[PDB]
Amino acid sequence: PRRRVIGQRKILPDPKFGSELLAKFVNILMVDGKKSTAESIVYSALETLAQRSGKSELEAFEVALENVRPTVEVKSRRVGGSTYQVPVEVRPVRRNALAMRWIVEAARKRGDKSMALRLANELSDAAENKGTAVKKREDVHRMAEANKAFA
Amino acid sequence: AKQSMKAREVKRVALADKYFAKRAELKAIISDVNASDEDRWNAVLKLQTLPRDSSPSRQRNRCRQTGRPHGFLRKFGLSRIKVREAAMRGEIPGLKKASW
Amino acid sequence: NQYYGTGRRKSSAARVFIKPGNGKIVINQRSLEQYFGRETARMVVRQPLELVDMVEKLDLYITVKGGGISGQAGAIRHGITRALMEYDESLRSELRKAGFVTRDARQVERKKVGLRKARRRPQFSKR
Amino acid sequence: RIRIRLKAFDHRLIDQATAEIVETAKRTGAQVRGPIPLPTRKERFTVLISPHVNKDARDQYEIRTHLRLVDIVEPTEKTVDALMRLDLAAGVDVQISLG
Amino acid sequence: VTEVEIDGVLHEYSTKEGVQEDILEILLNLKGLAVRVQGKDEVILTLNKSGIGPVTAADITHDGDVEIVKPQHVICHLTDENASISMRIKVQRGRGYVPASTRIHSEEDE
Amino acid sequence: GQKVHPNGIRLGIVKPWNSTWFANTKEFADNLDSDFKVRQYLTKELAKASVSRIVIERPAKSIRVTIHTARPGIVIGKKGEDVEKLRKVVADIAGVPAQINIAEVRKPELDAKLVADSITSQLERRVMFRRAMKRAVQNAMRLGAKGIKVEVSGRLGGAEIARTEWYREGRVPLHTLRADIDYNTSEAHTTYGVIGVKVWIFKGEILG
Amino acid sequence: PRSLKKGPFIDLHLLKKVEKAVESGDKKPLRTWSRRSTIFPNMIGLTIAVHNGRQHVPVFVTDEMVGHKLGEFAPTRTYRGHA
RNA sequence: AGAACCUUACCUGGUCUUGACAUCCACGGAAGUUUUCAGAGAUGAGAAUGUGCCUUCGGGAACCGUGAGACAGGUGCUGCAUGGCUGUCGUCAGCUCGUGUUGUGAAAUGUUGGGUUAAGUCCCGCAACGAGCGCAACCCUUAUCCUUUGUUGCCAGCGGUCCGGCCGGGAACUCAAAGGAGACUGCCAGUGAUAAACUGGAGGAAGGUGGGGAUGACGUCAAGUCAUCAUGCCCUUACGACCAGGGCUACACACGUGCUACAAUGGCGCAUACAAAGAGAAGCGACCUCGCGAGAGCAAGCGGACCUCAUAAAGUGCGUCGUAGUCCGGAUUGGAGUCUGCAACUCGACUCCAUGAAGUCGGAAUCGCUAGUAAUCGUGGAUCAGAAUGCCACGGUGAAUACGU
């Protein structure tokens, strides 16, 4: 907004692992304020993922996230007659969010049956460095690279 | 509303007042499962015979000042518009603008 | 001897009593696991205790009314915090830091004439 | 026991009435129960304020009916009768009920 | 006693149907009255009576917190059986002597 | 229709109600109707008498009317002759025992309703509306109003195009709830049409 | 439809008319406004000109028409086509 | 804020004409009460009772009847003759005035300028000095505490128990109202022009207008409303009044606002938890019995912190279905019925059994929302015999995002 920047609201860490990031992810996943179901789904995804990759539940998730975080995104300035997409260094708070969102989107897209399962699959893909979220990230990066002349 | 409409309403009310005991009785008779078929039939026919304005489902609640059929309130017997005016004037006891 | 604190959050109203003991929680003559099926709720009720190491030290009898589940839990937590404050009076700072002493004054915003809800305006069109 | 149900729109008036009733009770008899406040009825009303059309234009009124429950535990000869001559202020519907 | 309100009266120097004492005599006999209220500081009594015979002070329809301590104080002498009298007295509470002339403009409550 | 009614917004605080009784949902509408009737009757009767406020108050199946008027003498007539007459008719209207009290209005120039009525009367008898308005304002000021506003509207001087004109003097705070703002209205049924007169009179602020 | 316990509905006057017709053995059309009247077995054979709002339209009653009402065979609106 | 009749203002017929609604006389009859045939009904013709308040008796006030007119009546026209009420820019921070001064004057100044604020908010300057209406405050509500009063509300500690606050009781706690306290940049540090303020922190339930509501300046749009009401030409054996039936529910089509969907963050089945706020006497209607069910019968408790509406639903656990036009979706239609109501054909709602369209996230474009908000879940109320997916209220769960202009 114009007038005043405001402090981001307080977020509680999830009961299972005691993590803020996890909680955020769960929130993102959630729909129609049905938090509980969403959190259950998330947990399920984690468990399966853990089983698959070993490690811990949280650590694996973190790793997965890491492979889909964008260093740089673009924005539309459009000062000229035609529009110029300009790259911008995307901040720590935002980058984490974006990756999560992308992952969620991928999960939603995916052709597997249960939501949780789909999510798990997505996570696995991220970890391995294939899939939808990763592709999206690449695209984002690619665009930035293309428009690197603007800065 | 018109005068005529008001008059009609009044007439209806009067009719209702008149024929209540009989009509009610008839209704009861019609309902009563432990009763003769012929009797029931008679009752049904009897009801038909009675005037239509005798029914309470005929009379419309109008404003007691203006006779406006719509926007009515039961507690006050007034249409919204008149009710508001009353409120403003202090004429409805206890009624004031509410905020919460 | 039993210490006390009132809990309140949304339309919930918890009545938390603290006693010295082993650490068994009863909410309306039911266990914590029985009453709150949700893990989050459980966490929130245990939060203050976790913050100030007195989970094993004290039993607490609770009765809560009104609101839903999360709200109720919050209320309970608040009550617990209050009780703690009453009882020790030297743990206040920690509680403050946590953000549990604060009564969460967020009530549901009333529906407003014109609007379908508190803020949702109906669908607009120029034409 | 005599239960007394005071009902009024003005709260101050109701309060005044209640006090008066208590006074009446307490001189004659003994052990007046007390002036217990019951829940207030906030009967709300919405109305369209335009003569013709403007639906979002509205006034929301209400009538706050207050309740006061006064009880008298021992009805003596002198006490119960004292209320007969002792009428209360206007705009306060009282409702005494013995037993 | 401070204000006396008789029905069907114009001024205090008139006369009334069915009574002995005139209205100035009634106001003097009401000025001698002895009342003892407990809770309030301003009450309104009521006196209503018909029938042949004297009107004592014991005929006032008392409330609960007013006590009329002179049940033989005479006020009127109703002679006609078709006569009635319905006065509404107002009893304040103060001290000293405050008269009608000074209380002619002092009274704020219109 | 911008403004809130100045009496109506203040009924809980500084202004009181006119009809002052309790009734259950059963008898309330009827009571209201009765009030409307009696008030209407009173207005009809005591038009020539300068009457500001009829206050109805019914305890114990008996109606107590209180007429606030500038000149009691014309409402009372001969001592208890006119009032008595009024009473029985009131009772009839109600269907209960009636009791009429008559409050004497000190300073009728500061009572808003009365002023409005006067203005209307003036308009009816073909004076310059503006001069009347001025008189209304001035008089109130003289009497000790903290402020006054008056407004008149429509067919002023029988003109084809209707307009509103208004005179304020002193201060007349309407947004301030604690301000004693005596508001009232009237209507001049002239040869060219109706002319509505509003008048706000600010007595002062109440502190509580 | 109407409750079974209440029976079928027919206007009293209409019924009377029908009865009269039966008694006579005549076949002149009975003009009627009771569109809400149910058809009866005894009404079979009779022509009964039912009102459609505007005019009375003749309805020769048949064995198949019994359960139905008179207004079903007297259409009120008169739509030919849009072009 | 509710068209089957009524409503209703419209159409078709059938009828009335000082009239459905008032006032006035004249004079016939007490009003009214009961019942009969014809008629779609409006209406047009019959049989029974009564004579009350008062009379130098030419009679009266309530309430029917008839004729004369004076009049009634009109939801008929003009919102571009009006009042009142309403929308609107906009809860935008503005709009003015008096006196002074400047200018021949229209006008200007104040009200601009330096800062600052949500704010013509506040300070400082300054040919301005002051004032008013508005930007704020006073009001309701919500967030913490205290005092008072404890039933129909409550159960911490006591005894008893049918393990139900139910009964002795207790007045603690919740809660209920009534009255007080509390938040003012008041306190601390820095920045700032020796300022108004701003940035942070301390305490505190709450922090910088704490959240929400009410509150709408001068005015604008010959904005809306003569069909709420009132109000300054036209109809008056009809543009008035009564009636029955029909219509306002029509249907090649176009648009607006909603609901339900297209599914697995789901559907179905069984178990099971946690609300708030309301309504109720021509009313809400427990329990019990019957009905697959809508409901029916019987029938307490209750003008109601007591009784009833009244099981909250989403949720949680266990099972099942396994990506299908499906155990998704419910339109449509057939049958049979329940209730309301003189009356459900046109045209009510709800139930049961069957039937099982389109629809697999929607082109151009386009709307809402910054927090207990959106999203989603149920609950209640008004109007109301019956008839809501609308409107107005209530709580449940409960996000994302705000770099910046």
Side-chain angles (χ1 to χ4, degrees), chain F residues 1-4 9 13 24-26 151 153-155 159-162 166 168 170-178 183 187 189-194 196 198:
Chain F
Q2 294 154 107
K3 275 150 214 69
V4 71
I9 200 69
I13 19 282
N24 275 304
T25 313
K26 187 164 280 177
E151 177 194 295
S153 309
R155 288 286 230 161
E160 294 181 343
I161 304 300
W166 60 277
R168 175 187 296 162
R171 80 195 222 78
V172 187
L174 268 35
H175 282 44
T176 306
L177 281 322
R178 65 154 163 262
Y183 170 84
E187 294 179 309
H189 299 277
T190 70
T191 52
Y192 287 94
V194 182
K198 290 178 180 156

Side-chain angles (χ1 to χ4, degrees), chain B residues 2-100:
Chain B
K2 305 187 183 161
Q3 295 304 135
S4 74
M5 296 311 295
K6 287 169 193 177
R8 244 191 276 186
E9 213 68 60
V10 166
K11 185 192 177 186
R12 267 156 201 164
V13 165
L15 277 157
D17 183 37
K18 185 166 176 178
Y19 280 105
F20 177 73
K22 183 163 179 176
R23 196 175 205 77
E25 187 179 36
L26 275 184
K27 285 164 145 194
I29 284 162
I30 288 165
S31 301
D32 190 32
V33 70
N34 300 323
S36 302
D37 293 30
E38 66 190 327
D39 281 32
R40 283 245 281 281
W41 185 248
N42 289 0
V44 9
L45 285 251
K46 197 80 197 73
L47 203 50
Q48 288 172 28
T49 63
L50 290 172
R52 296 200 180 194
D53 284 6
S54 314
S55 185
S57 300
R58 270 227 158 190
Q59 69 218 45
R60 188 87 180 195
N61 281 324
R62 301 177 165 285
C63 179
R64 276 169 128 165
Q65 293 172 26
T66 59
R68 184 189 153 81
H70 287 297
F72 180 83
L73 292 180
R74 286 183 168 190
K75 184 137 184 167
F76 312 124
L78 293 173
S79 272
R80 46 193 190 74
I81 292 165
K82 287 300 187 193
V83 171
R84 172 137 185 281
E85 284 174 27
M88 280 27 270
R89 284 202 282 281
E91 264 68 304
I92 295 171
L95 194 68
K96 63 186 209 178
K97 290 192 63 149
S99 38
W100 68 95

Side-chain angles (χ1 to χ4, degrees), chain A residues 69-127:
Chain A
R69 287 169 200 175
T71 62
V72 175
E73 71 182 334
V74 292
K75 67 201 305 194
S76 301
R77 178 97 162 182
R78 100 114 188 90
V79 280
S82 299
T83 306
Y84 306 139
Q85 301 268 38
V86 309
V88 67
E89 200 70 34
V90 41
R91 73 186 187 279
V93 187
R94 172 159 170 74
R95 65 194 293 96
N96 233 25
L98 263 164
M100 280 190 277
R101 196 189 299 153
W102 286 343
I103 284 158
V104 168
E105 194 185 344
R108 293 331 228 304
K109 218 161 280 172
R110 205 179 200 86
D112 293 295
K113 294 186 167 153
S114 185
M115 175 53 198
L117 281 176
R118 283 160 151 178
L119 205 170
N121 283 21
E122 220 305 303
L123 282 168
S124 189
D125 276 35

